[PDB]
């Protein structure tokens, strides 16, 4: 019974623009990673919080990785159709509130269920839950983060759906501090309608079944991950000399 309206010329353009934006801001070879401060993995088989906080051995590298990724997300956001129609103030509120969520989403591309790691090259740039531990985070973040990565993998999103989801995540009218919620909602609705239309006319069954609702649930999951990351970052920040292991951009976004 369900009607399948064709994607409009505008919706086709929105998709092409977002794919282009992603291809310009996500290097699938991870070739810049050697420029970051090097990863260091202390011996921590026991998962000692005292040792993890004393050394924060993976923090400089992972902070550089996250900081780089925030820069890329800023570039991607600026190409979202309608984003530049927002005031600078609203653009910045949206970027700061969504950055960690878009990082977790976009990282799904390097995540692999082969061994449950983010595989970004040789051994040095293969990231596991134990690396997150070594950057001062705990199971309350790691467990739901891995569950999220696998759940998102198993949706088998088309790249079109993946880039639309990132855009929808960023252009959210319910973020604290937004001024023009109605304009943000209009931009988001244009994206959401594109996604709903795309799924209904371009995604074959049975993977298409209730797919939009599943994607919306992943956005809710990301809000929870954001809250948990924030709580843990706050405590990480209490570690003397932590700021030198971060970056000015990371300090601003999470502090």
Ligand X SMILES: C=C1/C(=C\C=C2/CCC[C@@]3(C)[C@H]2CC[C@@H]3[C@]2(C)C[C@@H](CC(C)(C)O)CO2)C[C@@H](O)[C@H](C)[C@@H]1O
Positions in the binding site for ligand X (CB under 6 A): 62-63, 65-66, 69, 103-104, 106-107, 109-110, 118, 120, 127, 132, 135, 137, 233, 250
What is the DSSP secondary structure assignment for residue 60, as one 8-state letter? H
Which residues are part of a known binding site for calcitriol?
Answer: 26, 69, 106, 110, 137, 229
In whole angstroms, what is the distance from residue 151 CA to residue 121 CA?
Answer: 23
CA 189 from centre of chain: 20
- The verdict on whether omega for the bond into residue 206 sits within 30 degrees of 0, i.e. cis, is yes
Nearer to ligand X, 107 or 172 (CB): 107
Q: How far is the CB of 194 from ligand X (least distance, A)?
A: 23
Nearer to ligand X, 7 or 170 (CB): 170
Q: How far is the CB of 28 from ligand X (least distance, A)?
A: 9
User: What Å distances lie between residue 88 and 17, 178, 179, 180, CA to CA?
Assistant: 21, 11, 11, 11
Q: How far is the CB of 176 from ligand X (least distance, A)?
A: 20
Coil vs helix vs strand at 209: coil
Nearer to ligand X, 149 or 194 (CB): 149
Nearer to ligand X, 8 or 224 (CB): 224
Nearer to ligand X, 171 or 250 (CB): 250
Q: Which residues contact 165 (CB under 8 A, 6 or more apart)?
A: 105, 157, 195, 215, 218, 219
Nearer to ligand X, 199 or 236 (CB): 236
Paired tokens of 122: 């040789």
Q: How far is the CB of 33 from ligand X (least distance, A)?
A: 8
Task: Find out whether 80 and 72 touch, Cβ atoms under 8 Å.
Answer: no
Task: Find out whether 218 and 148 touch, Cβ atoms under 8 Å.
Answer: yes
Q: How far is the CB of 137 from ligand X (least distance, A)?
A: 6
Q: Where are the beta strands (DSSP E) in the chain?
A: 111-112, 117-119, 126-127
Closest CA to 246 of 90, 40, 67, 42: 67
Q: How far is the CB of 86 from ligand X (least distance, A)?
A: 23
Which residues are part of a known binding site?
Answer: 26, 69, 106, 110, 137, 229
Q: Which helix (H) or strand (E) holds 194?
A: helix 181-202
């Amino acid at each position: 019974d369900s009607l399948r309206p064709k994607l409009s010329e505008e919706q086709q353009r929105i998709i092409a623009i977002l794919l282009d934006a992603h291809h310009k801001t996500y290097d699938p070879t991870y070739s810049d990673f050697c420029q970051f401060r090097p990863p260091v993995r202390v011996n921590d088989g026991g998962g000692s919080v005292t040792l993890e906080l004393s050394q924060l051995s993976m923090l400089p590298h992972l902070a550089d990785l996250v900081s780089y990724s925030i820069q890329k997300v800023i570039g991607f956001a600026k190409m979202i159709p309608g984003f530049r129609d927002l005031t600078s103030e609203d653009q910045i509120v949206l970027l700061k509130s969504s950055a960690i969520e878009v990082i977790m989403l976009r990282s799904n591309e390097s995540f692999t269920m082969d061994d449950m790691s983010w595989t970004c090259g040789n051994q040095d740039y293969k990231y596991r839950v134990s690396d997150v531990t070594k950057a001062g985070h705990s199971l309350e973040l790691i467990e739901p983060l891995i569950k999220f990565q696998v759940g998102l993998k198993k949706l088998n999103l088309h790249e079109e759906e993946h880039v639309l989801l990132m855009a929808i995540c960023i252009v959210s009218p319910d973020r604290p501090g937004v001024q023009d919620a109605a304009l943000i909602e209009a931009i988001q609705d244009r994206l959401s309608n594109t996604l709903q239309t795309y799924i209904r006319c371009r995604h074959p069954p049975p993977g298409s079944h209730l797919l939009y609702a599943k994607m919306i649930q992943k956005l809710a999951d990301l809000r929870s991950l954001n809250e948990e990351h924030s709580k843990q970052y706050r405590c990480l920040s209490f570690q003397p000399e932590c700021s030198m292991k971060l970056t000015p951009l990371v300090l601003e976004v999470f502090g």
